[PDB]
Every structure is written in structure tokens, then in C-alpha cells.
Amino acid sequence: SALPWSINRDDYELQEVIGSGATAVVQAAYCAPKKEKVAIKRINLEKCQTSMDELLKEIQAMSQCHHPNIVSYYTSFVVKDELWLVMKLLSGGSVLDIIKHIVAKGEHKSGVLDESTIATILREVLEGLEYLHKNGQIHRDVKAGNILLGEDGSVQIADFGVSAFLATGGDTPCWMAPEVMEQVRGYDFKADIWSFGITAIELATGAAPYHKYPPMKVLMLTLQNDPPSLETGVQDKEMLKKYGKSFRKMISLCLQKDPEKRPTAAELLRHKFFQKAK
Amino acid sequence: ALPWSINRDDYELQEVIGSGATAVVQAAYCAPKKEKVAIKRINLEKCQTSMDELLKEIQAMSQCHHPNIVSYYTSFVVKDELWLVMKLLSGGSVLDIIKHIVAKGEHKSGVLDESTIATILREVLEGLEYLHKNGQIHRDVKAGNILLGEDGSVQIADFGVSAFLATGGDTFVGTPCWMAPEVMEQVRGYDFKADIWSFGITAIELATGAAPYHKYPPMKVLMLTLQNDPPSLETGVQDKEMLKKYGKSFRKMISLCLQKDPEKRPTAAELLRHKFFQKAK
Amino acid sequence: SALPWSINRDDYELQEVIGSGATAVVQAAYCAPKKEKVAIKRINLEKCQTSMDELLKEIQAMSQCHHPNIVSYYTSFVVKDELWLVMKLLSGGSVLDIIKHIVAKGEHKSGVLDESTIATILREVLEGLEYLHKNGQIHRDVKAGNILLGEDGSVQIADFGVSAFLATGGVGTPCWMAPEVMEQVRGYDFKADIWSFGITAIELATGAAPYHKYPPMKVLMLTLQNDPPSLETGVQDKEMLKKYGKSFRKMISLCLQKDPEKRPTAAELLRHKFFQKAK
Amino acid sequence: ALPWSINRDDYELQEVIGSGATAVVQAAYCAPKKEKVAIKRINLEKCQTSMDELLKEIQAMSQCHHPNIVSYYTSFVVKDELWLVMKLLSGGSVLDIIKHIVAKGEHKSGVLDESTIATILREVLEGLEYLHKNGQIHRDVKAGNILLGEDGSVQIADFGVSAFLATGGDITRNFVGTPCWMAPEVMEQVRGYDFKADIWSFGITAIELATGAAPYHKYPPMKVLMLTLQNDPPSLETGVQDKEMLKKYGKSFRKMISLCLQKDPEKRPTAAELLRHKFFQKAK
Ligand SMILES: Nc1ncnc2c1ncn2[C@@H]1O[C@H](COP(=O)(O)OP(=O)(O)NP(=O)(O)O)[C@@H](O)[C@H]1O
Ligand SMILES: Nc1ncnc2c1ncn2[C@@H]1O[C@H](COP(=O)(O)OP(=O)(O)NP(=O)(O)O)[C@@H](O)[C@H]1O
Ligand SMILES: Nc1ncnc2c1ncn2[C@@H]1O[C@H](COP(=O)(O)OP(=O)(O)NP(=O)(O)O)[C@@H](O)[C@H]1O
Ligand SMILES: Nc1ncnc2c1ncn2[C@@H]1O[C@H](COP(=O)(O)OP(=O)(O)NP(=O)(O)O)[C@@H](O)[C@H]1O
Ligand SMILES: [Mg+2]
Ligand SMILES: [Mg+2]
Ligand SMILES: [Mg+2]
Ligand SMILES: [Mg+2]
């Protein structure tokens, strides 16, 4: 260990691409000084409608958040018109890959992951989120696809900071309507608690509730309906027999429209459901 | 139609009508027009704002003219200030009347009677319907912004720049399936339906003298309104028998406007047709 | 400011001495680029008989641990023969200051801190220790003197990393090895902090660690030779422990187990009945 | 009268007695002394040590002479090895004997009898007393380090350099402010340890002569650690299934072992006191 991570681009040999969007590439790289194969997220600032002045607070937050249930951020530096984020390489895939695999094998009759694997994975997610919240931070993009698995059996939340920020859009009132009030006050960590309840639905049913709808209809479907439950998007109600009352109550505590009514991650760690974590 | 002057020297400043942090309303004589106007002088610096950020507001102001909307004449910058030149309505506002009644101690069985609320608010709905048809939002509907002409006219003030500053001013690729509702609400905008809520609160204020959460600090008003069911006519009132005279149609009207879900609120055209507004003189 | 702390000595203007010792000097400093008054711990590497090479891992650890219950570490750099540690400046003194004030005034006739005050402060300590333990870290120097209060009401453990490390002294198949030899072979782990935490609760209740009356070399032997201490060990008279009930005493006996495997983790202690007394 | 040579040209290397990663023990003829010796060749690179770290060990070795300690003659570096020149005990070790009895199948109901354990361990205790009263610790007491003379002598091997290396070097070397908040296991480390560590090892060696093996020989090195620190101190029967494999071991032998096997070093007797034990009256 000893020293700080190199901000010299030439200290990193680019290797196999892991994933490739528009326009961010997650590529494996070897860092000789550290003798470690790492993952580099390469974000073209131009293409994301962003800049280094916009992203500074986000990078400062990533430099400060260090916990075993958060993918280690090592360092970041600009390479020409790209921001590079150097992080720990997790070789176990995401929880979403495991979901896609169970579904593709047709093993999802009666449910996708059983109640005790969900308790186990999401307990680790709640420990990471509780740490971020205590630190005055918000993840913003909690989902199965951002829960990464280490070869050591560790569960780590990915994309805290710049990635999540870019994924979620970047950045007396006596007469003022509630929806104006809502945007005036902004939002807080309790937003993660809602996304956490959606993520529980996704691990049980394989998909988020309104997954069948285009992006702008999901916004409306969500706001013009009662909060979703396991039953909202599921293929068949038969898939919901692996799941009992304490899981459903856990989910429904998360999924309240009023953020103040949602429990904190620490209170959730205490829920009856999380006693099933083996 | 003949243009208003944009030269500061054409306007002789007179009585100060209202003075705050950020803004003064002052009477002025405009010699070229031979007309006594009101100027709202806004400190752009104190308001943490610029003419760049205000351009679209000013543009909307210069396009939006209706008998139920205070006449906007012109605007120009003087040193550190944006001056907004508008019609002078010295008869003042519905709030001035409210305060007179409260000051006399004549507010204990209600402030304004049903027929006078219906008359006033009908005119406000005509002004709002005009803005709304035209893709505009007011943002700051309240009694203090309903101005009264000597001739009986009812006109909504502060459209544009002032309602913008008064209320704060202040996507993304992918499917928002995990996004919290309060986050989605901020992402989507808001629209003219927000005025209908402010309208329902204004109805409460005309009858009782005040907004329902008037006794609370600014941040507690946000929490109480976001956390609780909408306020009723009687929330801000200790004598729960005060408004026993105010009937079913008024209360129904207010509860249509005071719905948390904006899609559920009526349009201003729809409210104009409400049974309550048949009470107007 | 979103930028990193400066590692140039000249961006810092050294002011009033906050605290001292034969070893290190803590000074208030203004950092001009950051417009903040910070605290700089200046450790004389010569007088501590250490080196930057012995300490780099400690600083690494400091640079990685960030939690609202651990004093914030900003930066560090070497000036001549001193290691300078730039930290958040806290203005509420320590829990030890409060203890010494209550003791000097003679207000400790039925105990120094109320049970709900001890529960509140120590709950915050246990959140910081649990965080550090989760990250594979050990504090090593848990004590009242290292629990700092912000004038905002926050509770923050001080001296994680270099200072605690310095304050604390920096085969085959072993079938024939004596247990005291095996103990040093194995080193120790985070359960050491849980013992110190248990002594720290005694200190908050009674005003001092249990064997405070004895010289430092006899403390080693006193501890090793006897059953673990309790509230009653270092006190005169049992009416001086009138504030403290059964669950407090049980919490403490759980920490003060000679076998570390038997001590609970900080996470487990947070779930203890005693801590339901926290305001 | 002639000093032991430090010239590698004075030595002829012969049969390899023992090999390993760390060291090779090799017979050798020393020419000016006209004697067949044993040389322990220690690879300093491989052992992650240096002549600087080892000098106080060598000094102790050149000081510590007793009939119950294998004779150290001299030492010198040849290239990357340190050569420890010592008396050749061709009779081999007590562990060679145990291994022979176990390979013959003759270890059921026990390995060495009581009187032969008594005879040997008394000689080890003499050598230990000599070491301890002189401020020395052996650190690697066990059957494999009890070497036998053609003449009946019993001598402890590996005093100094070898025992130091075998037990992990300066890891097991034996601040201002009061240590009031310090955990007992941290205090045990700051205090180091003393000659009483050898009395525990002697206790384990007794079990080994009787059963063939140390109590937790079946376990990986780190399980052994955990076990001995977590559990009660071992006894004669701890790793033995058919407990009738210990019928001819009496009460005074087991009591002797249990005096040795106390977690608290101060409770353990000195080698002097052990010499007076009723069990060592069974020695011939
Ligand atoms: N630190 C990491 N270690 C190992 N794999 C990673 C790491 N970070 C990302 N990945 C994977 O590499 C790809 C990352 O692409 P990315 O640009 O993050 O978009 P995405 O993961 O497909 N969608 P989203 O996570 O919602 O932003 C995905 O296949 C991830 O599962
Ligand atoms: N065109 C106008 N003619 C006459 N009086 C006016 C005019 N506009 C505003 N006023 C009065 O000037 C005073 C100050 O008004 P204004 O700057 O609107 O602040 P406010 O009404 O106290 N609060 P807000 O409307 O939310 O900024 C008020 O008493 C108004 O009644
Ligand atoms: N970040 C900080 N903010 C405010 N005060 C501090 C900070 N760090 C240390 N101090 C105080 O500065 C003084 C001297 O510091 P130090 O040399 O750490 O002495 P100490 O408190 O005895 N610590 P130790 O190393 O455990 O003996 C003490 O009175 C501390 O309480
Ligand atoms: N002076 C000696 N005379 C005769 N044989 C010896 C002498 N010293 C050691 N041996 C034997 O040489 C072999 C290897 O010796 P050595 O490596 O010291 O012992 P070990 O027990 O195999 N290893 P360790 O105990 O881990 O250092 C063993 O079989 C010893 O019995
Ligand atoms: Mg991912
Ligand atoms: Mg007005
Ligand atoms: Mg301190
Ligand atoms: Mg040997």
C-alpha cells in the first residue's frame, strides 16, 4: 500500500473493456506502481453536458467516502477531454447479472432470489447507505445494477459520486403549492430509501415495478398511482409465494410518497426482515 | 401604443408606497405621458439576480395584457436597480382591506362576505385564465397581489419578475424506475395548476384574514403543507364557529383547489363555472 | 471550496498554541486559501524516535477514514524534522475537561456523569469505533481525553492514526509455544478498542481509570494479575456509584473480558440495553 | 588447546543429516581439530535475517556451555549461509526414537515409559536451569531438540540462532504515559515474556514423549494458536481418542505436566523446582 494513487496517466496500462455506454467506458487497467488491476471509468465531459467545475463537489465527496460496502474510489484525473475515475475492480459481476441469469434459466417461478439471499445482500447495501447518509451524502442511483460482488463474497455499492450524479440528471411560502414547495426544498437521503425499496422489488421479481413503460410514462405512473408493491410489475402472482409479510412490510415502509415517513437505513437494519440474513 | 420612455429623467419620483429589503414601490410622475405611475424599483444585487436571468420574465410581461392584470408599461436599469413602470392603483390591495377590518376588530365572524369574495376572485380567475391559456404562470397569487382600481377594477399584480423573485427563481438519459417521487416531482416541472392551489389559499385568506399556516415560521409552513393533508378553511382559526356563515359551495370550491395532486385541481375556466361564483354581484 | 488542502507550509499561518507536551504541539492556524481556522498537530519525529517510513501507513489510514464521529483529517506534510497534521479545529474541549471540572468542584459524590449523558456520548464513540473496525482499523487509544465535543453538540474521537499509534508504542506449527508468546505472535485486533471503551466508561462514571492510583509499570501487572476491573475498583466508597444501575455495569463487564473473542463488537454494543438511555 | 577454525578450507562437508527450506545439517570433518562435526548451514537470505540481527544470539551461544546443552564450537559466514559448527550427536534425537516406536506400531498404550521420560527430562531440566539462572531463554524446547549421545548423554539443541529463527525472530523478542486503557493482550505484548515460557514448552514436550505428539499436532498452525489461547490448558489426554493409550502414566506425571501448563507464567514452577518433583524420582 503505502503511497497515494498516481495521477499520471502513463502509470496505467489500459486493458479489456468491461462495459461501454454513451458515452462512458468502464475499462480494466493495470497500475504498475500499485501492482493492481483496477477499473477505470472514462467519462467524456462534452458528451455528458458537464464540466470539471460541476463535478468537483462530487469528486470531493468520493475522496471522502470510504467504507467496505462502497466500491473503493482510488483517484481521478483528466485525460484530454475525458475524466478518468480509478476504482477497485470487482470481479463478481452485479446483482442484476445474477438476476438476468436466474430469469434466463426460467428459475424464477415462485420468485427470483429467495428471502435470505435478499436479506443478506440488502443488509450490506443498508450498511453502505447508512454510512453515506451519516456523512451527509446521498447515493441517488440505488438499483441491482449498482450492487457489485467481490470474489471475496463482499457486497459493494457502485457509482457513488460523479456517475450517480450524471445518471440522475446532474443538478413565507403560505400560498405556494406543494409541488413547488417540494422543488424549493430539494430532496434528501430519504430518496435513497425509496430507491432501496424498488431495488428490493427488483431482486424478488427481476424488474422494477413500471419497467414495462417508456421513461416519461414511468414518471407519471409513479406520481399518479399509489406506491408500487411486489405485485405491480411481476409477471405472475405465483412468483410472490417465496415472500412473506415482514418482507412486504419492509418494502412498504420504504415506498411511502412522503419521504419523512420512510425509515432511515439504520432503522431498516433493525427490521424483522433483516433477521433472515444468513 | 405610444412608447413609454426608458430615460430615468422622464420620471419624477414621489411618495414611497412600500419599501422592503430588495424592492421599493414608489409613485412617479411621467412628464412625457402626463401620467402618475407606480415604479417598483428592484435591487438586482440584493435579489442575487441579473438582467440575463430576467429577460424571459420581462419579455412575458411586455406581451401579457388583460384588464384583470396590472398594466406593465416599460422597464429599464438605473445604477443597481431594475425599475418596473406600471399602472398606479393607489386604492391599493385586497390585503389593505383585510388589515383594516382586522385592525378594527371586525373580523370575528369572518373578514370579507361570500358575495364580495366571489366578485373579487371571479376577476382574479379571468386574469389567471388569460395567463394560463397563453402558457404563462403567475406563481404568487395572494391577497397582497390583488390590486383595486378607483373604478371598481380588480387586477392581479406582480406577474413576471416580481413573482419570479418572490418565489425563489431557482433529464438525464435512462429509465427513472428507481427514482423517488419527490425527485420525480422536481424533475418534472410544475405548471399552471400551482396557481389554482394559491388561489384556494387566497380564498381562505379573504374569509379568515390569513393563510392557514400563518402562525408558523417559514420552514415549518413547508413541512406542515408537504407532510399533512391539505389545510382547511378552519385550520388557521381558533374560534371554530367563526365561519359558520360560509356555506357548502364556498367550502367545496376551496377543497377542489386544495388538492395535493395538481392533475386533480380544476382549471381557472372550470372554476369560473363553479356554483360558488354565481354569488358574485 | 471543493479543492484539496494545501501541502505548502506557507498557506498556513501558525497562531495560538492549543495544547502541548514533551512530544507534539497543537497550534491553531489560519489557512488562507481555504479561509478556515484549523488545528495543526506538530509532531517532532526526532523526539518521538520515529520516521516518516514507520508512519506512512498510519497517514494512509487517516486519509481514508471519514465519519462524523472521527475528528476530520485534512492533510499533512513534513516541515524540517516535524510531521504536521492538519485537522478540523474543535472548540468544545474534551470529555476529560468536563470530568476534571466536575471532580475539582466535588460534584462527583454520587458519580461523575449521569447515565444518559454517558450513554449519549458513548453511543457516538461506538458509532465511530464501529466504522473504524469495519474498515479493518484499530484506534488503540480510546479514553476520555480523546473524545472531543464540538460547540455544535457533536462527539468526535480524536487522534486516530499517527498520534494514537505513537502514544501507544508504535514460525511453523507452534504446538510448543507458551500462550504469552503466542499472544505476541498473533498481535492484537479491534477487540483491544472494546476493552479500552470499557475502561473509558469507568472513567466517565468515576472520574478515572480503575488502576489510576498505581505507577505505570504496576498498572500492567495489576491488570494482568487480577480479574478484570469494575466501577468499584478505583473508588473509595460505593455510595459514589449511586448514579449507576445494572445494565451499565453489565455493558462494562462485557467489554472488560480478558479473552478478546468474548468481547462484543461495537455494533453489538450499540444494541445493548444501556444505550437506550441515550438522549 | 587449538581454537576451532573459522576457515571454511579446514572443513570437509560429508553426509546430509537433515534438509529443509531454512537450513541443512551436514556432517563435516574438521581437519586441524581431527574431529567429525555437525554444521548447521542457515540461509540468511531465505530466513529473512542478517548477521547484524543475529550477533547477540551468537554471543549468547559462545557464552553458554553446559553438559546438557549441545556444544557450540564456532560460526562463520560462507557466502549466503551462516555455518554453526557444533558437536555431532550421531545418536540423533528423542523425536527419532518416538518416530521409530510409532512406525513399529508400538506406541499404543504410550510411547516412552515413565522412567525413561524421567531420565531424559531431568537432563533437559538441568540444561534449562543453567540457561535460566543465567538470564537466557531457549524458546524452542521439544523432542526434536533433545539430542542423544552415544554415551547416554542428553543435550538440548538449537540454543540461540536456531530457536530464535524457528519462533519467528524479533516478532517474539522477550511510550510515555500510563497504560490504564490498554487491553490485557496489548499489555502482554509490551511486557514481552521470560524464562517461564520454556516451562510451558517443557510441559508440552512431556506430553509428546508420552503420546508421540503435541496436543494439537493435527491442526493447522493458526488453529493451534486459537485453540491454546481460547481453551483451557492441554493435558496428557487432549488429542488422544482411545484414552486407554495412557494407562501406564500415573498421577504424579500428569500433575507435573499440569504445573507446567498454566496460562499464567508466574504460576509455573522454575526448572529448579521441577527437578525436586516426585515424578523425577522415577529417573534411573
Ligand atoms: N468498479 C467496478 N468493478 C467491476 N465492474 C464494474 C465496476 N464499475 C462498473 N462495472 C461494470 O462495468 C460496466 C459499467 O458501465 P457503466 O458506464 O457504469 O453503465 P452501466 O453499469 O451499464 N449502467 P448504471 O450502473 O445504471 O450507470 C457495467 O457492466 C458494470 O457492471
Ligand atoms: N401598481 C401599484 N399601484 C399602487 N400600489 C402598488 C402597486 N404595486 C404594489 N403596490 C403597493 O406597494 C406596496 C409594496 O408592494 P410589493 O413590492 O408588491 O411588496 P408586497 O406586496 O409587500 N409583497 P410581494 O407582492 O410578495 O413582493 C404594497 O403595499 C402594494 O399594495
Ligand atoms: N482537532 C482538535 N481541535 C481542538 N483541540 C484539539 C484538537 N486536537 C487536539 N486538541 C487539544 O490540544 C491539546 C494538546 O494536544 P495533544 O498533544 O494531542 O494532547 P492530549 O490531548 O494529551 N493527546 P494524547 O496524544 O492522547 O496525549 C489537548 O488539550 C487536546 O484536547
Ligand atoms: N549437533 C547435531 N548432531 C547430530 N544431529 C543433529 C545435530 N543438530 C541437528 N541434528 C539433526 O539434523 C536434522 C535437521 O536439524 P534441524 O533443522 O536443526 O532440526 P529440525 O527439527 O528438523 N528443524 P527446526 O526445529 O524447525 O529448526 C534433525 O534430524 C536433527 O536431529
Ligand atoms: Mg455498475
Ligand atoms: Mg402588490
Ligand atoms: Mg485530544
Ligand atoms: Mg535440531
In which residue are the cell numbers 500492567 written? C220
Binding residues of D for ATP: 17-25, 40
- The answer to whether residues A135 and C67 touch, using CB atoms and an 8 Å cutoff, is yes
What grid cell was written down for B163? 413573482
Please choose, from the candidates D85, D73, D66, the residue with its C-alpha nearest in 3D space to the C-alpha of residue D134. D66
Nearest CA to ligand 2 atom 12: B18
**Looking at chain D, after which residues does the C atom sit over 2.5 Å from the next written N, breaking the chain?**
174
**Residue C213 counted as an annotated binding residue:** no
Ligand 4 centroid vs D163 CA: distance in angstroms?
11
Work out the number of other CB atoms within 10 angstroms of the CB of residue C168. 21
**Looking at chain B, after which residues does the C atom sit over 2.5 Å from the next written N, breaking the chain?**
170
The residue length of chain B stands at 281
Neighbouring residues of A133: CB distance < 8 A, sequence distance ≥ 6: A189, A192, A264, A265
In which residue are the cell numbers 516451562 written? D199
The C-alpha atoms of residue C95 and residue C197 are separated, in whole angstroms, by 14
The C-alpha atoms of residue C188 and residue C7 are separated, in whole angstroms, by 34
- The answer to whether residues C272 and C251 touch, using CB atoms and an 8 Å cutoff, is yes
Question: With left for phi above 0 and alpha for psi between -120 and 50, is residue D275 left, alpha or beta?
Answer: alpha
Rounded to the nearest angstrom, the gap between the alpha carbon of residue C163 and the centroid of all alpha carbons in its chain is 10
Write the secondary structure of chain C as one string of H (helix), E (strand) and C (coil). Answer: CCCCCCCCHHHEEEEEEEECCCCEEEEEEEEHHHCEEEEEEEEECCCCCCCHHHHHHHHHHHHHCCCCCECCEEEEEEECCEEEEEEECCCCCEHHHHHHHHHHCCCCCCCCCCHHHHHHHHHHHHHHHHHHHHCCCCCCCCCHHHEEECCCCCEEECCCCHHHHHHCCCCCCCCCCCHHHHHHHHCCCCHHHHHHHHHHHHHHHHCCCCCCCCCHHHHHHHHHHCCCCCCCCCCCCHHHHCCCCHHHHHHHHHHCCCCHHHCCCHHHHHCCHHHHHCC
The C-alpha atoms of residue B276 and residue D204 are separated, in whole angstroms, by 100
Amino acid making up residue C99: I
Neighbouring residues of D122: CB distance < 8 A, sequence distance ≥ 6: D275, D280, D283
The C-alpha atoms of residue A199 and residue A207 are separated, in whole angstroms, by 8
What are the φ/ψ torsions at residue D74 (nearest 5 degrees)?
-165, 180
The C-alpha atoms of residue D274 and residue D261 are separated, in whole angstroms, by 13
Question: With left for phi above 0 and alpha for psi between -120 and 50, is residue A205 left, alpha or beta?
Answer: alpha
In which residue are the cell numbers 480479574 written? C227
| Exposure on the CB side of residue B187, measured as CA atoms within 13 A | 22
The C-alpha atoms of residue C260 and residue C248 are separated, in whole angstroms, by 20
Q: How far is CA D224 from CA B12, B123, D141, in A?
A: 98, 91, 17
| Residue D248 burial (C-beta neighbours within 10 Å; 0-12, 13-18, 19+) | exposed
The C-alpha atoms of residue D159 and residue D165 are separated, in whole angstroms, by 11
Rounded to the nearest angstrom, the gap between the alpha carbon of residue A251 and the centroid of all alpha carbons in its chain is 17
What distance in Å separates residue B166's CA from the closest CA in chain A?
A: 9
DSSP string, A144-195: GGGEEE-TTS-EEE--TTHHHHHHTT----TT--HHHHHHHH---THHHHHH
Whether C212 and D167 lie within 8 Å, measured CB to CB: no
- The answer to whether residues C183 and D185 touch, using CB atoms and an 8 Å cutoff, is yes
Gap between the terminal Cα atoms of chain B: 33
The C-alpha atoms of residue B122 and residue B277 are separated, in whole angstroms, by 7
- The answer to whether residues A174 and B222 touch, using CB atoms and an 8 Å cutoff, is no
Work out the number of other CB atoms within 10 angstroms of the CB of residue C128. 23
Please choose, from the candidates D60, D25, D62, the residue with its C-alpha nearest in 3D space to the C-alpha of residue D42. D25
Q: Which of C141, C152, C159, C259 is catalytic?
A: C141
- The answer to whether residues D69 and D155 touch, using CB atoms and an 8 Å cutoff, is yes
Amino acid making up residue A39: A
What grid cell was written down for A209? 415495478
What grid cell was written down for C251? 455493558
Q: How far is CA A265 from CA A124, A126, A248, in A?
A: 11, 5, 17
Ligand nearest to the CA of D92: 4
Ligand 1 centroid vs A38 CA: distance in angstroms?
13
Question: With left for phi above 0 and alpha for psi between -120 and 50, is residue A169 left, alpha or beta?
Answer: left
Please choose, from the candidates A111, A71, A87, A90, the residue with its C-alpha nearest in 3D space to the C-alpha of residue A202. A111
The C-alpha atoms of residue A172 and residue D246 are separated, in whole angstroms, by 90
**Residue C19 counted as an annotated binding residue:** yes
What grid cell was written down for B204? 381562505
Stretch (H or E) spanning A44:
strand A36-44
By three-state DSSP, how is residue A85 classified? strand
Rounded to the nearest angstrom, the gap between the alpha carbon of residue B90 and the centroid of all alpha carbons in its chain is 18
Please choose, from the candidates C66, C69, C71, C77, the residue with its C-alpha nearest in 3D space to the C-alpha of residue C31. C77
Neighbouring residues of A233: CB distance < 8 A, sequence distance ≥ 6: A201, A205, A207, A208, A209, A210, A211, A212
The C-alpha atoms of residue A264 and residue A133 are separated, in whole angstroms, by 9
Which domains does chain D possess? 1-88 (3.30.200.20), 89-284 (1.10.510.10)
Ligand 4 centroid vs D67 CA: distance in angstroms?
18
Please choose, from the candidates D43, D27, D28, D24, the residue with its C-alpha nearest in 3D space to the C-alpha of residue D82. D43
Neighbouring residues of C218: CB distance < 8 A, sequence distance ≥ 6: C211
Establish if A102 touches chain B: CB-CB under 8 angstroms.
no
Gap between the terminal Cα atoms of chain D: 35
Q: What is the DSSP letter of A72?
A: P
Amino acid making up residue A166: L
Work out the number of other CB atoms within 10 angstroms of the CB of residue C81. 10
Establish if B194 touches chain A: CB-CB under 8 angstroms.
yes
β-pair type (B23-30, A155-157): unpaired
Select the residue of D141, D180, D189 nearest C184 (Cβ to Cβ).
D189
For ligand 1, mutation pick of A15, A16, A18, A211 (most atoms within 8 Å of CB): A18
By three-state DSSP, how is residue A86 classified? strand
β-pair type (B154-156, B146-148): antiparallel
Residues forming a β-bridge with A83? A43, A78
The answer, yes or no, to whether any atom of ligand 4 lies below 6 A from the CB of D86, is yes
- The answer to whether residues D59 and D160 touch, using CB atoms and an 8 Å cutoff, is no
- The answer to whether residues C87 and C28 touch, using CB atoms and an 8 Å cutoff, is no
Please choose, from the candidates D32, D39, D25, D41, the residue with its C-alpha nearest in 3D space to the C-alpha of residue D4. D32
The C-alpha atoms of residue C107 and residue C112 are separated, in whole angstroms, by 7
What grid cell was written down for A163? 456517475
The C-alpha atoms of residue A189 and residue A160 are separated, in whole angstroms, by 13
| Exposure on the CB side of residue C193, measured as CA atoms within 13 A | 28
Write the secondary structure of chain D as one string of H (helix), E (strand) and C (coil). Answer: CCCCCCCHHHEEEEEEEECCCCEEEEEEEECCCCEEEEEEEEECCCCCCCHHHHHHHHHHHHHCCCCCECCEEEEEEECCEEEEEEECCCCCEHHHHHHHHHHHCCCCCCCCCHHHHHHHHHHHHHHHHHHHHCCCCCCCCCHHHEEECCCCCEEECCCCHHHHHHCCHHHHCCCCCCCCCCCHHHHHHHHCCCCHHHHHHHHHHHHHHHHCCCCCCCCCHHHHHHHHHHCCCCCCCCCCCCHHHHCCCCHHHHHHHHHHCCCCHHHCCCHHHHHCCHHHHHCC
Select the residue of C2, C60, C66 nearest A57 (Cβ to Cβ).
C2
By three-state DSSP, how is residue A99 classified? helix
- The answer to whether residues B141 and B156 touch, using CB atoms and an 8 Å cutoff, is yes
If contacts are CB pairs under 8 Å, which of residues 130-169 in chain C contact chain D?
A: 141-143, 166-169
Please choose, from the candidates B176, C24, B122, the residue with its C-alpha nearest in 3D space to the C-alpha of residue A217. B176
Nearest CA to ligand 2 atom 13: B18
Q: How far is CA D33 from CA B108, C172, D9, D149, in A?
A: 126, 36, 13, 20
In which residue are the cell numbers 435579489 written? B47
- The answer to whether residues B30 and B83 touch, using CB atoms and an 8 Å cutoff, is no
Q: What is the DSSP letter of A105?
A: T
Give the CA angle between residues A99, A100, A106 to the nearest 5°: 90
The C-alpha atoms of residue D12 and residue B224 are separated, in whole angstroms, by 97
Q: What is the DSSP letter of A276?
A: G
Establish if A210 touches chain B: CB-CB under 8 angstroms.
yes
The answer, yes or no, to whether any atom of ligand 1 lies below 6 A from the CB of A19, is yes
Stretch (H or E) spanning A251:
helix A245-254
In which residue are the cell numbers 427481476 written? A206
The answer, yes or no, to whether any atom of ligand 3 lies below 6 A from the CB of C18, is yes
Ligand 3 centroid vs C105 CA: distance in angstroms?
23
DSSP string, chain B: -PPPP--GGGEEEEEEEEE-SSEEEEEEEETTTTEEEEEEEEETTTTT--HHHHHHHHHHHHH---TTB--EEEEEEETTEEEEEEE--TT-BHHHHHHHHHHHT--BTBSS-HHHHHHHHHHHHHHHHHHHHTT------SGGGEEE-TTS-EEE--TTHHHHHHTT----SS--TT--HHHHHHHS---THHHHHHHHHHHHHHHHSS-TTTTS-HHHHHHHHHHSSPPPTTTT-SSTTTTTTS-HHHHHHHHHH--SSGGGSPPHHHHHTSGGGGG--
Amino acid making up residue D75: S
The C-alpha atoms of residue A67 and residue C66 are separated, in whole angstroms, by 9
Q: In the complex, which subunits touch C with 3 or more CB pairs below 8 angstroms?
A: A, D
Whether D228 and C179 lie within 8 Å, measured CB to CB: yes
What grid cell was written down for C75? 492533510
The answer, yes or no, to whether any atom of ligand 4 lies below 6 A from the CB of D95, is no
Gap between the terminal Cα atoms of chain C: 34
The C-alpha atoms of residue D165 and residue C182 are separated, in whole angstroms, by 15
Whether A65 and C67 lie within 8 Å, measured CB to CB: no
Q: Which residues of D touch C166 (CB under 8 A)?
A: 175
In which residue are the cell numbers 498473533 written? C186
If contacts are CB pairs under 8 Å, which of residues 39-58 in chain D contact chain C?
A: none
The C-alpha atoms of residue C65 and residue A65 are separated, in whole angstroms, by 8
Establish if A190 touches chain B: CB-CB under 8 angstroms.
yes
β-pair type (D146-148, B11-19): unpaired
Kindly compute the dihedral angle of the four CA atoms of residues B130, B131, B134, B135, in this order, to the nearest 10 degrees: -150
Which residues of B form the catalytic set?
Answer: 140
The C-alpha atoms of residue A165 and residue A187 are separated, in whole angstroms, by 14
The C-alpha atoms of residue D84 and residue D57 are separated, in whole angstroms, by 12
- The answer to whether residues A107 and A200 touch, using CB atoms and an 8 Å cutoff, is no
Ligand 3 centroid vs C204 CA: distance in angstroms?
18
Q: What is the DSSP letter of A90?
A: P
Decide if C81 is catalytic.
no
In which residue are the cell numbers 385592525 written? B103
- The answer to whether residues C271 and C126 touch, using CB atoms and an 8 Å cutoff, is no
Select the residue of C56, C63, C68 nearest A135 (Cβ to Cβ).
C68
In which residue are the cell numbers 514452577 written? D269
Stretch (H or E) spanning A24:
strand A24-31
- The answer to whether residues D64 and D127 touch, using CB atoms and an 8 Å cutoff, is no
The C-alpha atoms of residue D225 and residue D206 are separated, in whole angstroms, by 19
The C-alpha atoms of residue B33 and residue B11 are separated, in whole angstroms, by 10
What distance in Å separates residue B169's CA from the closest CA in chain A?
A: 9
What grid cell was written down for A220? 407519471
How was this structure obtained? X-ray
What residue of D is the nearest CA neighbor of C209? D180
The C-alpha atoms of residue B254 and residue B211 are separated, in whole angstroms, by 13
The C-alpha atoms of residue D39 and residue D25 are separated, in whole angstroms, by 6
- The answer to whether residues C41 and C131 touch, using CB atoms and an 8 Å cutoff, is no
- The answer to whether residues A172 and A105 touch, using CB atoms and an 8 Å cutoff, is no
